[PDB]
Amino acid sequence: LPRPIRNLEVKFTKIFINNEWHESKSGKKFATCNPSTREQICEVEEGDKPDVDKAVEAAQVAFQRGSPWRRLDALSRGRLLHQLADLVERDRATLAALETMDTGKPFLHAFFIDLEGCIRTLRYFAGWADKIQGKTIPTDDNVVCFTRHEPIGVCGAITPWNFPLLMLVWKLAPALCCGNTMVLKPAEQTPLTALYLGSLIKEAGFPPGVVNIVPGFGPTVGAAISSHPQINKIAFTGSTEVGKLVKEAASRSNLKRVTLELGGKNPCIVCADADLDLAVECAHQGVFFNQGQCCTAASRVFVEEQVYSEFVRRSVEYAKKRPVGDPFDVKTEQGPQIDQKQFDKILELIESGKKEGAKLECGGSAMEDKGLFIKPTVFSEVTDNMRIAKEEIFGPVQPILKFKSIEEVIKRANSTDYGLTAAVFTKNLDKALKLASALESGTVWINCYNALYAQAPFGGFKMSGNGRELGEYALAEYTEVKTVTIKLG
Amino acid sequence: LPRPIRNLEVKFTKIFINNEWHESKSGKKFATCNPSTREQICEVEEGDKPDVDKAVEAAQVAFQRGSPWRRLDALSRGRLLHQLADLVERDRATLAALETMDTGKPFLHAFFIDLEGCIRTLRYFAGWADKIQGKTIPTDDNVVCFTRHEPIGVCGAITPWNFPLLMLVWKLAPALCCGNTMVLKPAEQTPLTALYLGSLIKEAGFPPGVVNIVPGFGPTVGAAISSHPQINKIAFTGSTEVGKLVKEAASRSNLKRVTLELGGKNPCIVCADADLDLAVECAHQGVFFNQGQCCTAASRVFVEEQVYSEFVRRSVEYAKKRPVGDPFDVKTEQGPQIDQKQFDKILELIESGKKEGAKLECGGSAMEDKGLFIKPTVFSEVTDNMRIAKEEIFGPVQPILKFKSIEEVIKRANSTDYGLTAAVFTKNLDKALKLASALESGTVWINCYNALYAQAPFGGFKMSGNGRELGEYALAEYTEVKTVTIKLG
Amino acid sequence: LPRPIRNLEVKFTKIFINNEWHESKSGKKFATCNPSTREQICEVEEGDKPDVDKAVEAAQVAFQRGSPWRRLDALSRGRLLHQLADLVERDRATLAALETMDTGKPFLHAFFIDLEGCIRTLRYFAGWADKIQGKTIPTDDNVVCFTRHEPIGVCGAITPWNFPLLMLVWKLAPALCCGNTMVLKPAEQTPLTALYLGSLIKEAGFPPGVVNIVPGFGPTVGAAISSHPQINKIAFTGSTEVGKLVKEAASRSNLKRVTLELGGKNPCIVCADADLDLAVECAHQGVFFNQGQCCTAASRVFVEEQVYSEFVRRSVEYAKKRPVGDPFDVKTEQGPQIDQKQFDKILELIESGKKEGAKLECGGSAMEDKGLFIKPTVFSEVTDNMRIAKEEIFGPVQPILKFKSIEEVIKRANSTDYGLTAAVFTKNLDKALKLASALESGTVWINCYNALYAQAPFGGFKMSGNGRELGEYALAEYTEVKTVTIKLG
Amino acid sequence: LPRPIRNLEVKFTKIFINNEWHESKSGKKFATCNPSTREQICEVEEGDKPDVDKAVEAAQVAFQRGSPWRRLDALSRGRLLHQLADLVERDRATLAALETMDTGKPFLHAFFIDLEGCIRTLRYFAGWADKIQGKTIPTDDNVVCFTRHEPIGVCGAITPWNFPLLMLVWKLAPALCCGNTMVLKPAEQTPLTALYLGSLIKEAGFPPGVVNIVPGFGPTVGAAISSHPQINKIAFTGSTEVGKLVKEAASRSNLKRVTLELGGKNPCIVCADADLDLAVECAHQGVFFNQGQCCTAASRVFVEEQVYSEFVRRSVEYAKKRPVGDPFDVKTEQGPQIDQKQFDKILELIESGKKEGAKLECGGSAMEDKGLFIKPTVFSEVTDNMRIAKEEIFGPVQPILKFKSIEEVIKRANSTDYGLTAAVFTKNLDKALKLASALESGTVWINCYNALYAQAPFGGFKMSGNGRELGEYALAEYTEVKTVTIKLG
């Protein structure tokens, strides 16, 4: 375990364009606060449309034919991405501390989970750079026909506050491996790790203008990126409602391509033949990981009647033993919620569950009347039409529902507008495969939870998103297909 | 050569749902009129929102787990598509005669071009049904990870008036081969071939609800398909303006996936070392084919200064010998235009050319007041800022521009918001390949024009579209990726 | 069920070259006998090296550049293969009767299994013809690099006596879909279905010389094909010992590519948590199908101790109820063995099992002292070092062995030089996947047996073969990779 | 430019097994001598059958299930290969000096050509380790079918004397990236770089037994690897005659898979429209690079009659200015030949040219009696039936043949039993593509020669080899396909 850097001085708080640090055009700044100490960390430069316009023009010049970045051979782009992963591993403790200060997640979780995900994602996509291949297509005796997988051009990345550096790297790694240029917008709540990564990008040797970063707000920077007529592609992670606004702005303007990684109403199904202890620990971590602030969070834990009561009992014991406190402390498993708006919203849904009919098995209130901490809550006797079972909580609350048959639980799990992830716990080959096939979800985990790999694609069915991130499938979002058809005389 | 059908009577004019013919729920009907004889062929049922709701419900029931369509093995869906291709070959003359009566295009063009493409596309995708493969991904020693390429669900298709049946087949062939269900809306101007196809779909053996057809108007039937909360995917062929409305409505409702095939400002590049007779004849067919009413139409012909005057001279001669007239008449190379609007805008573009400084070389006015036909027009001394070189003409007007260097023509060719097709004419290996890689177009033809194959993908860069039709790439538009991760004890 | 054609007159008994029927150069003929009636069916022309030489020269001329077959577009080759599958389906009853007369397999098994396999294999590979694609490879800014998947050229096919038409089609379908020419040698024991297929090949429209067939013996025709300096590839199905001779002759001569589908010592593992009735019926059909004359035949049935005794009892009941008789009779499940050499060899191994220590549970002798029929035999108490558990029987004998643990049964199943197929029967997800991974076998079936698909590759690990048949993997055996690298100046 | 090492002492001369250095079991040793100074560098341990048996056993234990190598995750094998590439870059000067002392090739050629290829190949295949994906195949509603691309097992590698370390890396990089274990045998003439690599393999962290190195002779160590019953795959680079012995021995023992990279009779085709200075300089490097001792050497230079005399004139001038001499000397373009045999056969081929009717234009004899060097020779008026145009020279002799038509030169170029590489020089798009598709060669270079990439496959058609090295195609040689079919109840 590394030593927690309790007091770190922030060095990077400016707009990053053409490998230079700039003040905002207006002079405006915004504060970034620590959700644990409830104190301001620093002020970051606040961008607007004029700053986005300078960042898009920087990215266009870097992408123009004959530019140093365009004439670089495929293996050199991979080398640059490996050089960046080395720099991320060198400054791993500085980066994880910035993530903890901005988000409130435990320092050890950001070090061993978020930063490991970033390094792995960068190394996997560095290896694809010289392996992006098109096809040679058989047609007629006198025709030569082939496809090229060309870069799209300028890519915009809009990232969320829960996993700020990870969600940025998920977009940056395949975009740069494909030979594109970028304009990044970190979340208004969490800009520090993105700005740190900027210095490492300059240090790794990327030509100026290949990566540009403009901190600021959704209605200003976000809207300017979504509607820009010179951005060819946008990747967005966040809520379904904001995702819809991004896609509409993209259509209305220049029909730029749009990847969306949105929310879900994720089911977690526990069969009567499951290894109950495994199912209890996995459903527990699936709900409470990152203070329940995960897109993959189990929002509906369906448990077969034969094991329901024991499942509830063993889950309650886990929830009471979960250490909540200072994220810079080695024993901490749960930090504070991101902000007052999220904290009050979780408590509003917890109160709703009480007056709807659920059985509060433990938790149900704040830890102390001073911080943003919520005690791990477990609700039993939860039904399909209750608010705690219908709405995305984004907090530490485990709603446990009951089911009798597989055909029934399939219908109940698929009755949502969402389809991000699903998890199934059973020892029976036929049940597991029937459920893997019939669940309308982008990822189905069997006898595990949150099992993510740089090489396995991730994304949603229905209103949980469009397109995929990770794996070879992420390259299709960052390339344009060109068919060359030559007729011989 | 086949004989055209004299008094072919239309038999299918109703709404097609669950393999049955229905009258519109409002009782309303609309007229389909022969553009050549200017007389009404018949009255087709006019659908609206409640007919679309009835078709989507029928498609959802056909897509349910355990339905005859879903439980069919992969090779049987291919067998059905081969059975449909056989019926389209048997009734080839009936379908081509319906297409001539609706669009006014020459009978031999619809028989040997449109119907040939329909048959080749159906046969090509019939072969993909048992070859849609996902991946097995290596991760860790104790994990089994894989992807499934599942059907998306209910697909809506919205097609244009210029190639009614072919544009319909381009969407229907990969959708059915991937195991989806469909709700089709033919253009209001040309609904007869789509309705005839419905009878063939029933005869071929497709289960009820797999293909549903709802004739009607854009603001009514089209809008209802775009906004439908139970349609998972939509494919649209038409204009950039209508494509933007379709994509905006899709994002506003349920984030359904959208493929778009739109227009372009397609350049032709003729180098000094081209086979000048090949380039003249290909650029001629590129500008004047189907009365210039084709998404692949060349709207800018760039010619190197060394061959400029001779290219203009031979193009003027070639355009004068072109036979325009009666569609059913064997000798006809160009039937009539589609409508009054755009006909006026073409003559207004022609007048704009004369006033902006271009040299009218031939044509430049209407033919003979008993049908909307334009005389093949050729403009020389054309420059980039002129209207005839900036707007999408959609008529028989050939603007010939001059260029000196390859670097200059690449920049002028790509100075557009569009990028559907491009054509290069040169006998030089390095020039051909430098232009193929530098042109920002979905398709680059070398020493040919309109060379399309069911096996080569087709689609636009920038504002010319999203996604691809044809080839193995069409399958990505009709499938959803599911990752299944299994952790072993 | 079709009507069994009890008395059929054979029409095709000659050498097929350039779509013409020829007598052998020497004048020699060989007899083909019915293993049921023990009477001669007819005399077939007997080829030698001079006949093979004329067949290879016919195949070379058909393959030369500019030949009708080489200039045919990809989709036309697929069309030809579909035309052949239609002709095979038309003459399905004639073909299945010829297979029964030559092999002794039940007419219903040849109609519904062998002939269905042929038709399916032909239709699947007809669909690959226009989908054989190479790659476009990213290298340097100034280099264009791509691969072509070219046909190999003249292909030799040497087929066995157990599934004569099926094993021929497994080789012919991908070879012709890839654009190759062929020289076929059916087994000396079973030439009639191959010669029938020749007439259908001429009838389907294949140019002369694309498929050539030379009946005869292994040391004459087989050796001439293996060593021919103008044959580029050979595919062989048969014994490991003859497979080794084929591969050596291929190396010694011109280094032609060689696919080998050889024998196996196939394990069939039955766990204590298996659905015992399913495991009993699958192991039964796996052993006794085609009179035990299958390359996929279970030679070692390992059963966990908890269910051993019941497994033995239920298996014995199946073996006693199995109908043995005239293959042209609707109730027959088991015909005669192929010949006297095979029949005496099976009885020699059955006697060996008696004097080695096995418990003869049923069967053990011929049905009548007049025919080639052997009564279904089941041996219990079989151990690893017994002859009935070590050697390939190729007859109706079920050796049932016992195991205690999974780690033990993995070591015992993998202790062979072979690795064709394996089958596992369990309801536990982890056991099934651990066994699928750790068994060194080309195909692992879980809760099924003999589940073959045109789209799933088949072949052996270790001494069970080289290369694969079926699926997309079969195309790699029938194409040569060419890299084209172009440097731009 | 780097400085050559003056008195570099060799440190690694023993047998490498289980990450340890061993003396040969017989105690025997053999001498490695510098071909330039003609003095003994050192005495390397001489292995035989019992040392090969000890290396195969160590490789089998490293390949067992549960071994540290097998249980490593896919990304960690790539990490190890990147670690090895870093050590090869660090010790680049030591490795290139060892290669110069063993082969006599110029120090700057081994530093910037051989060592560069080794580093690029290792880095390329390090990126494939987590991207080797099998397929999920669609079959029936109730079946789950998939393929796994598993490692083959123990791989033997047998390399030549001309590019010792590079040919070793071409086999080692994909074998280790696929998870195999290896037994290597460097050429008897050049074993020092292979032994040095072994120390780097231990330093990099590869578990013991993963790579084992056994120096020795062909008839002893090579024969034992070819016939070993526990080696699953062998890769061989060398002559067609030795390759046939290796493949015959492999088939005779256990049917181990064999990749072969052999010689060729590589043509150069120069069209009348070529850039004549480019073609002269490329055909010169193609004939005289590495003293003509390269598998890619041009052995037939076909020139169109229109440029024939001028091509011969400029080639004669170019060959006269070529600097031959001391390898460590910066100015040297061509060091000495390898051995006494072949040196005599080259002068005998040269004399055969004069007597058969060819015109000796320059060179044609030895240089200066104190080393085996030949003066760059050029023959004009060469015809197909002549010895200088039929035999593989393997020396600095340029035979220039004349041609009139493209159809004629295609036939003359392909009238060989070989087909490794071909090179075409033309500025014409149609000629370049017609020749690329009609030449029967594994690689067709256009307007370049020796343009190799770790990402483009390389190998021969006909008797030039079996299988491919480099690119994604190399992975098929180092994996075995397993189909897993699961039928659901």
Author numbering:
A (entry chain A), B (entry chain B), C (entry chain A), D (entry chain B): 20 to 508
Give the article text.
The human aldehyde dehydrogenase (ALDH) superfamily comprises 19 enzyme isoforms catalyzing the NAD(P)-dependent irreversible oxidation of aldehydes to their corresponding carboxylic acids. At the intersection of the substrate- and cofactor-binding pockets sits a strictly conserved cysteine residue (Cys302, ALDH2 numbering), which is essential for catalysis, acting as the active-site nucleophile.
The ALDH1A3 apo structure at 2.29-Å resolution shows a few electron density blobs inside the substrate-binding pocket near the catalytic Cys314 in both monomers. These electron densities could not be modeled with any of the molecules present in the crystallization cocktail. A PEG molecule can also be seen within the substrate-binding pocket in both subunits of the crystal ALDH1A3 apo structure. All crystal structures contain a homodimer in the asymmetric unit (left). The cofactor-binding domain contains a non-canonical Rossmann-fold motif, slightly different from that found in other NAD(P)+-dependent enzymes. The three crystal structures described in this work do not present remarkable conformational changes among them and share the same disordered areas. The volume of the pocket in the cofactor-binding domain is 444, 439 and 411 Å3 for the apo form, the ALDH1A3-NAD+ and the ALDH1A3-ATP complexes, whereas the volumes of the substrate-binding pockets are 231, 220 and 208 Å3 for the same forms, respectively.
